[PDB]
Design a protein around this nucleic acid. Sequence first.
RNA 1: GGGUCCGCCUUGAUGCCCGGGUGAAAGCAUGAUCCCGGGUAAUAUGGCGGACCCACA
Lengths: 121, 320, 74, 53
Amino acid sequence: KPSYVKFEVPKELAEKALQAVEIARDTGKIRKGTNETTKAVERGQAKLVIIAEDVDPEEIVAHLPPLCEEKEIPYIYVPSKKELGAAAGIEVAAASVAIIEPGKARDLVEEIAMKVKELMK
Amino acid sequence: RILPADIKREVLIKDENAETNPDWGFPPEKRPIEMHIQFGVINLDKPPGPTSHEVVAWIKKILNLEKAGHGGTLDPKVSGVLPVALEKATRVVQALLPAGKEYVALMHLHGDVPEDKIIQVMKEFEGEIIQRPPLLRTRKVYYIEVLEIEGRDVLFRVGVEAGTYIRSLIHHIGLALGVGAHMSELRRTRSGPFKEDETLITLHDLVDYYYFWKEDGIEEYFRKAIQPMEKAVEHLPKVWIKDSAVAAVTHGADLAVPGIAKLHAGIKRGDLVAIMTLKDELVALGKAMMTSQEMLEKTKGIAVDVEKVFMPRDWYPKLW
Amino acid sequence: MKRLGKVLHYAKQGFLIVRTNWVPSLNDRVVDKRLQFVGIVKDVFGPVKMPYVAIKPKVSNPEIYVGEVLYVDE
Amino acid sequence: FRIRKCPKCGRYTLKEVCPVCGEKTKVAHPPRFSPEDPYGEYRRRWKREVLGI
RNA sequence: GGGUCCGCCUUGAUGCCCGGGUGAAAGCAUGAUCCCGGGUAAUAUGGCGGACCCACA
Ligand SMILES: Nc1ncnc2c1ncn2[C@@H]1O[C@H](COP(=O)(O)OP(=O)(O)OP(=O)(O)O)[C@@H](O)[C@H]1O
Ligand SMILES: [Zn+2]
């Protein structure tokens, strides 16, 4: 799998990330698409970044992992951009999503942010 | 399959005892990075969106260059091989304008046609084809290779003479098939001697390799980003000249017969030729005043009218 | 009259298409064997030796001429 | 865009898998470049990691 | 007087591209839409000057 994927993500944790997008979409606020996600990180609004693993060209989302690490924002990988798009509530694919306000998935984002920090190291 | 750039030419020997002096000249291999850039050509993979001229302007601005030029205009929506000659090499693109091109194209049919009929009709468009009806202007299609058919979509590779409009070719195929067709996607895979190989580079990798040179001191990546100007000349008939004739040509003299050491066969009067040193350096582009047989047999006369000089005057000493 | 050839089909973009063995000129008048006016040559394309000709029809129902042989009125 | 290419054998296709060797294909066109290149520094950190710089 | 190299001298019916903001029925989050900022329009020919040469190797 592509070189922008820094760490191996378990099947269960990827589902929890997609669940976190689904819930926060209608209960809180999310940014969907690479430009919106990147701005959210740049502005320090994103609490969690979700990046697809099937992005081609890779350069589209390649800047995100080192941007997230600079701005101290946790990130997670999901297998499919099509699946990530549907979770964001759009009919097309999404290369990356950002969560601004988790809403009801607040505890779910906490669980992800703690578990990705262990995968990072 | 094969473009006129692929068929090898015989090298005719005029002077068997012709020798080159290592004291003079800079062959591509021993050019310092700065000189390499000065006489360089980027084999660029153009992104769809910007014009070819915009992309060249981006390159000049980012690499801090005074001059640059591209070898055969790619339309804005079209991606692929775009030779970008730099600085002192800028004008070598003139050898690339009339060169044969290769494309991968996607044709979308406006009706349902059986696979056998698609292939048969497209096979008919190989050879000399009419690009403008009279009241006769023709263009050569060297090959059409149908890669796959997915319903109304036909993906194919096509090798063409310079000035062949692929959009037009597809429109005409659609008329010959009855149902109509349009070009939904185009990518250039070859522009003369430049093709999709290890040397093809994106703007992203180009600028990043430049940064690896300026900040990290690593020149190897940016060196590989740029080809010598001699590459832009690989498809042309060549005349190899003696050391004693090199400085004359770079000072404005036309090439006379007693200066020729080696030459390609098949050169006709009026042909664009590349004048080379015996170290395979590009000296000049010229118009042949003689045939290959004339150059080989004769002892006197102007063989090549020199049109564009690329080699600096001080590389070889004045020996005339 | 100089024979063009069989009408292969009526293209939906609005042209009768004929395969022939010579190169007609733009705006040449096109008739059938009985000299009845059919249309006008608007494009010549394909192989130089065996080109396709796009004929802009000037009759009400051009579809009836599919499979019929057309000529350039001279 | 839907023209794809096999990275290893160089086959042009519309399919997700290569019809020749049987591996995942990549889109044929290069990504959009910006002369402003706002995130080029972050791309380089990734690229230096990959190339071992 | 000429050639080569370089410098200088001319025009353009809102587009398109890139970016900042916004972020939505075949299109489309790998960016719709609109607002704003920038970039690029024919990579000639003719003319004037500067430098180097006038070359059969
Ligand atoms: N008969 C036609 N006349 C004009 N344009 C056409 C015609 N058929 C297809 N096209 C063009 O081809 C494009 C391809 O889109 P679309 O897939 O809807 O076409 P299609 O013929 O239905 O293809 P498919 O049947 O494979 O889905 C369309 O946007 C349309 O502009
Ligand atoms: Zn393959």
